[model samples]
Target: GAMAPSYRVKRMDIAKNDEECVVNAANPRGLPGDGVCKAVYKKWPESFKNSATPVGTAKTVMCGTYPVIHAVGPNFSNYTESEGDRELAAAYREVAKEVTRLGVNSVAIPLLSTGVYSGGKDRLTQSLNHLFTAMDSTDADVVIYCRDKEWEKKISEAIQMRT
Candidate 1:
């Protein structure tokens, strides 16, 4: 899944039957059981909590016996100008690899960089498009879950790359 809390909340509106998981962009130590967590917890008390597998690398955790992949963090908050771009790309790549490795059929994702990192949506759009494109090559059903219409439309357009 896109793993962002906002996207996760929005997804519940549509795929309520689908399992929910937590993926912290910053890979927080404990679960985000306060704000977003509370809402999701209410819906799925036993939802999966997939933290990034490797401490700092791209990893996926399948918690709660569902295909929900929890991507742990170490995100761009502390990213440097030198490593920011490459690391950002690497993070998404890792997300893609883990989604593929785990054989997830359907996954949802958030606007990977709409928060914290700033570049007017263009940089975010570019990086996210690349990551999603690479993962789509693996044949898993992908959902770039967004918080609002603009992001939703952005990803939908980006996903049109094949056609």
Candidate 2:
């Protein structure tokens, strides 16, 4: 396969929708669609990699095979703040690892804490910062995407701080 610079940015509302699209519609941005949902729909419209069940709350749904669409269900009330933070960060690291396994040049992500889970920006950002730092060391490129101005600023700030 040849390496190509392939990236597309669009509102999920205008793009294709899937199970995760349902989750996004229920959550913030309510783009009436999914984040990774569109990616999977566009990339692999046929099916998913295997039977990788979603590891989140009830709202979460399995949208794709390789890349998954998950809903944030469990509230931070039950777990310690640190525990929730670890969970958020772990998701990022795990996804990054998957992208690397896909043998792709890079992987892109939305603001992990923005949609369903709110008020955890600081913690989420910290986790992503650490996760991406580890991913950057790998041969694969990493792209963290946030469409809204607020999240875009937040993620950009995190990356800048690390650099």
Candidate number achieving the greatest lDDT relative to the actual structure: 1
- Candidate number of the best TM-score: 1
Each candidate structure's TM-score, on Cα atoms with residue i matched to residue i, is 0.63, 0.53
* Regions of model 2 farther than 4 Å from truth: 1-78, 119-124
Per-residue lDDT tens digits for candidate 1, residues 42-159, read 5444443443254235544334555444443234456654565665666667676766666555555554445544333355565575565456555555545445666566656655
Candidate 2 per-residue C-alpha lDDT over 1-163 given as tens digits, one digit per residue, 9 for 90 to 100 = 1153332222334223221122121222222335544554455443332323332321222434333333332235454667766665555555545555455554444545554454544444554564565466455445554456665566666666755
Window of ten residues with lowest summed lDDT in model 2: 19-28
- Scored by CA lDDT, what does every candidate get? 0.48, 0.43
Model 1 TM-score, all chains together: 0.63
**Pairs that clash in candidate 2:** 21-33, 21-34, 48-65, 49-65, 60-71
TM-score of 2: 0.53
How many angstroms is residue 44 displaced in model 2 relative to the true structure, after the best TM-score fit?
Answer: 6.3
